[PDB]
């Protein structure tokens, strides 16, 4: 199968002067995110929080406040540069949840072993009227 990579906490971060668009109390109390990648050389890139940074040669680790920021930066890395990346979610107690790419293959590429979730085997016009689910606690699309 696929063994998710382990997060190495001794990975250097890009050279950056700091900004007002970084982490806030949510990272302290709720959660934050970490994106890691490997760069062939040292080069300038655009931060998703504003301003420009310099990625070092070798491994790079970056802390961000939302998953959407991680995916935006990862798409920029994959499209503009040619760099493989992966990101995780980090909780206040220190536990780490590997997030993306979930099984080592990008979601847009079909892969065996994935279980379907939220599939209705009918056309969208076959959903029932709301009156048929009144007082039942269900949704007309939840089948």
């Amino acid at each position: 199968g696929f063994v998710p990579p382990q997060l190495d906490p001794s990975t250097p971060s890009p050279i950056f002067g700091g900004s007002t668009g970084g982490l806030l109390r949510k990272a302290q109390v709720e959660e934050f995110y970490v994106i890691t990648w490997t760069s062939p050389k040292e080069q300038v890139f655009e931060m998703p929080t504003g301003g420009a940074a310099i990625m070092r040669e070798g491994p790079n680790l970056l802390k961000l406040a939302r998953k959407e920021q991680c995916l935006a930066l990862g798409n920029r890395l994959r499209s503009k540069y040619k760099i493989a990346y992966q990101f995780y979610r980090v909780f206040p107690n220190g536990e780490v949840q590997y997030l993306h790419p979930k099984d080592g293959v990008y979601p847009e590429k079909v892969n065996a072993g994935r279980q379907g979730v939220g599939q209705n085997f009918r056309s969208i016009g076959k959903n029932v009227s709301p009156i048929e689910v009144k007082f039942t606690g269900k949704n007309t699309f939840d089948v």
Partner: protein, 159 residues
């Protein structure tokens, strides 16, 4: 002279002369709110004294009765009423924010990473003691300002 806060480029803050000057650090650390190891009651006393003392002037000099031989009493009474409202609102914030017996929500790390005792202000009992000190000090400061202005009648530029 502008650096990331505590050397961390990816925390949403910066170090500037406004934020990190040694004079600014000393002044902020010597205010009652940042005396983390001192009793909340005495810090509340100081804060209440200061604010109640300063609140007398606006009410006394700008109110509807400013041109009446009872303007000073009206200003002092208005300051006391505002202090009462602020004390009620402080009690409301304390009751909503802190449960009884919960540990302090203040940070327990210094700028250099040394662990410290969490500030007892951010607790139910500590906030209640601070609020009591604030109310007592506010009333006392308003009375003291009134006594200086309209009892002894000391020479002031405007009174």
């Amino acid at each position: 002279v502008v650096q990331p806060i505590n050397g961390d480029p990816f925390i949403g803050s910066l170090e500037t002369p406004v934020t990190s000057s040694p004079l600014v650090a000393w002044y902020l650390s010597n205010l009652p709110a940042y005396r983390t190891a001192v009793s909340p009651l005495l810090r509340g006393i100081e804060v209440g004294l200061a604010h109640g003392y300063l609140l007398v002037g606006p009410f006394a000099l700008t109110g509807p009765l400013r041109n009446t031989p009872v303007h000073g009493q009206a200003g002092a009474l208005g300051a006391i009423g505002l202090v009462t409202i602020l004390s009620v609102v402080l009690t409301m914030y304390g009751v909503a924010s802190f449960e009884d017996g919960a540990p302090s929500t203040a940070p327990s790390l210094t700028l250099t990473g040394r662990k410290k005792e969490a500030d007892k202000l951010q607790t139910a009992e500590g906030w209640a003691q601070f609020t009591g000190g604030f109310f007592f000090g506010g009333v006392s400061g308003a009375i003291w300002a009134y006594f200086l202005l309209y009892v002894l009648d000391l020479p002031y530029f405007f009174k």
